Design a protein around this ligand. Sequence first.
Ligand SMILES: C[S@@+](CC[C@H](N)C(=O)[O-])C[C@H]1O[C@@H](n2cnc3c(N)ncnc32)[C@H](O)[C@@H]1O
Ligand SMILES: [Zn+2]
Ligand SMILES: [Zn+2]
Ligand SMILES: [Zn+2]
Length: 232
Amino acid sequence: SKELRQLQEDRKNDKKPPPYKHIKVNRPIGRVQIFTADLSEIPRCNCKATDENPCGIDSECINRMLLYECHPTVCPAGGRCQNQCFSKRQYPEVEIFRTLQRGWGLRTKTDIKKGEFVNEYVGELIDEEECRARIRYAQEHDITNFYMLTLDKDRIIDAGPKGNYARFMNHCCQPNCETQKWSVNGDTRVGLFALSDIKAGTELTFNYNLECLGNGKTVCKCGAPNCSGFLG
Ligand SMILES: C[S@@+](CC[C@H](N)C(=O)[O-])C[C@H]1O[C@@H](n2cnc3c(N)ncnc32)[C@H](O)[C@@H]1O
Ligand SMILES: [Zn+2]
Ligand SMILES: [Zn+2]
Ligand SMILES: [Zn+2]
């Protein structure tokens, strides 16, 4: 109970989170590269411009089904294509709030429908050498908040120093969002998507699936009845 009493006090006193730079797109650091592909490598889906909601959430779209974003100059549905979520950056409105046991969190200001694009997990894109250095620094300074998610081998998104609102989304063993790795313009991106209808005011969470680098020993405080005890 000793730690809880302190947490009650902290929640009262903590007016704002530590500063970070709010950015729109991933920022490669050092020798990290972002890759591109020729347009010939972007798939054309099965949607037609005459369909009710071409390439939409509820459509038959194979690109959406395989986690490929359509390209606007290529998609058979043309300007009616509803599968350009990462590039268009239309996110549901959200706000940061202070939790008791899980630091700062994020809650939605609007209703969100099952399958809707919620956010892109954006940050600095760093290599293993840089990740280890940052994790070691944090550990040496008793920092227990990590914002690192692997994109692929030797390319890690660190939303700590620079990121967007997705950096505030906490882990839950019964979450209402999930990460998905998509191919956008010939390279990988990490999106957050709603698992169910979510009501305005609700905290947005996802299952970290042990991907948050540095949290491998962390005890989960999500409070779900099916809690694994860890961030995954
Ligand atoms: C991506 S940040 C989420 C925002 C963070 N709570 C903050 O104050 O900035 C991930 C960190 O939040 C904490 N965290 C998130 N979910 C948690 C959970 N279910 N149980 C315990 N700590 C959690 C851990 O310290 C983790 O390293
Ligand atoms: Zn389509
Ligand atoms: Zn399309
Ligand atoms: Zn849990």
